[PDB]
Design a protein around this ligand. Structure first.
Ligand SMILES: CCOc1ccc2cc(-c3nn(CC4CCNCC4)c4ncnc(N)c34)ccc2c1
Length: 457
């Protein structure tokens, strides 16, 4: 009897994106052609909280659960360096990204959204599974269809894996986390809190607990106080605010349960004219842009650091390989050395590496059947990734700059770097080095420059 190997069954199509605990890779069954979204959790980057026995049992259970608002899980694999969580793929993107793209959004729309969330949660709770880390990024739409269902992701991971302490992994988490979770004693009621935060945001476009940085947000959450004294709350029903109050009740025993929330007057009324919440849409669009850009900023810096690391490592690997030191390696050698390097969740296969080497070779017009200048290859393979990272950031800059002004203001930078948890006098210092004209604003290139300076370049 043999232990099942992931890559024997699945091939990687492409990267779907970055999630909690690992990279998510779109994959395809080598026989049946079934497409799946595979979260790949790196054992080196993420520590386990539970034992083997406890994990395997949870997986086994999760595979048998079924609910339209919960991500479907098909398979589980494990090897020396990784876990592989194989689930159903969803094509509709993040809930909030869909919402800002609309012209109209009412309490009716919000109620139908929250019912779906509460429904999925209620089910998982019945089965003694807690999310804990529930937020808008974990709410995916099933498809691109207007009336596509919401699929909750990452249920059950937090019980078994330790959360990353890295800011690039924590963006947005602080707004939604329940106070009891901070202090250590928590139960399924923490998920009702998070949903309550999400609802508050849906109807006002602002987080109830907010701050200049991660810790300030957490101070507010811990204190647990909030208000409906914003202007845009005047547009909202009393019942909506009543449910929010009940979900954002501090003491968890006093907090309304998920199942009881589904029976709340507000849910019952609005899910059976209602004005549009135009101000809420405005605020959510701004909120989302800011979050997405701070994320992009952190990923860019991370990619730059990774590249500096990998560039020198790859060169050192090939140098050792280049035994007579003439600078000439062949394709099979480049592959072996690239393999030794990756020893990219997307590259966890021999054929993946063969493919990627070939892509690099084709770009530089090097003949693949002869011998190659490895120094030249290295430059291209890394520049590709550097170029890719630059493009992702730019897109985020342009989206944030909704007025197409070409610029980001000093106030805006304060917000962005606050969310990125970059020290104030630190970024200001780097801004001072770049903005020698006292314009109090930066263009894309200047902004990029700052980020390079904030990662030791
Ligand atoms: C017991 C849990 O086992 C599993 C197994 C697979 C999982 C797959 C996904 C997943 N991630 N992404 C990438 C999106 C990029 C844009 N930002 C939002 C996410 C996805 N995109 C589409 N569909 C997906 N299913 C995912 C998330 C959690 C999973 C958990």
């Amino acid at each position: 009897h043999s232990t099942a190997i992931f890559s024997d069954r699945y091939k990687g199509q492409r990267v779907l994106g970055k999630g909690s605990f690992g990279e998510v890779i779109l994959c395809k069954d080598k026989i049946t052609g079934q497409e799946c979204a595979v979260k790949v959790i790196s054992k080196r980057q993420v520590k386990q909280k539970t034992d083997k026995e406890s994990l395997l049992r949870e997986v086994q259970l999760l595979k048998q659960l079924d609910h339209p608002n919960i991500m479907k899980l098909y398979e589980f694999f494990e090897d020396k360096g990784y876990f592989y969580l194989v689930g159903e793929v969803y094509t509709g993107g993040e809930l909030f990204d869909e919402i800002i793209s609309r012209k109209r959004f009412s309490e009716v729309d919000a109620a139908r959204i929250i019912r779906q969330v509460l429904s999925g949660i209620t089910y998982m709770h019945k089965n003694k599974i807690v999310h804990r880390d529930l937020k808008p990024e974990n709410l995916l739409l099933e498809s691109k269809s207007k009336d596509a269902n919401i699929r909750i992701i990452d249920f059950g991971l937090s019980t078994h894996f330790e959360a990353s302490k890295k800011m690039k992994d924590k963006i947005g988490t602080a707004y939604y986390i329940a106070p009891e979770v901070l202090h250590g004693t928590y139960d399924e009621k923490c998920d009702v809190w998070s949903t309550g935060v999400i609802l508050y945001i849906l109807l006002s476009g602002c987080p109830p607990f907010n701050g200049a940085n991660e810790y300030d947000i957490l101070k507010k959450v811990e204190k647990g106080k909030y208000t409906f004294e914003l202007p845009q709350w005047k547009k909202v029903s009393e019942s909506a605010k009543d449910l929010i109050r009940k979900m954002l009740t501090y003491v968890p025993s006093m907090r309304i349960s998920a199942r009881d929330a589904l029976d709340h007057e507000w849910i019952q009324t609005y899910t059976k004219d209602v004005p549009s919440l135009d101000n809420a849409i405005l605020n959510i669009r701004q909120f989302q842009g800011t979050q997405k850009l701070a994320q992009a900023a952190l990923l860019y810096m991370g990619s730059k650091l990774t590249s500096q690391d990998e560039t020198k490592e790859l060169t050192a690997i090939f140098h050792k390989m280049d035994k007579n030191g003439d600078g000439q390696l062949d394709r099979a050698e480049l592959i072996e050395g690239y393999k030794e390097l990756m020893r990219d969740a997307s590259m966890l296969d021999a054929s993946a590496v063969e493919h990627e080497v070939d892509q690099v070779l084709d770009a530089v017009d090097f003949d693949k059947n002869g011998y190659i200048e490895y120094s030249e290859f290295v430059t291209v393979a890394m520049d590709r990734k550097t170029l890719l990272s630059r493009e992702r950031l730019e897109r985020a800059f342009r989206m944030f700059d909704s007025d197409n002004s070409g610029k980001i203001s000093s106030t805006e930078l304060a917000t962005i770097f606050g969310v990125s948890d970059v020290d104030s006098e630190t970024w200001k210092s780097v801004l001072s080095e770049v903005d020698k004209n006292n314009d109090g604003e930066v263009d894309f290139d200047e902004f990029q420059q700052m980020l390079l300076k904030l990662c030791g370049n």
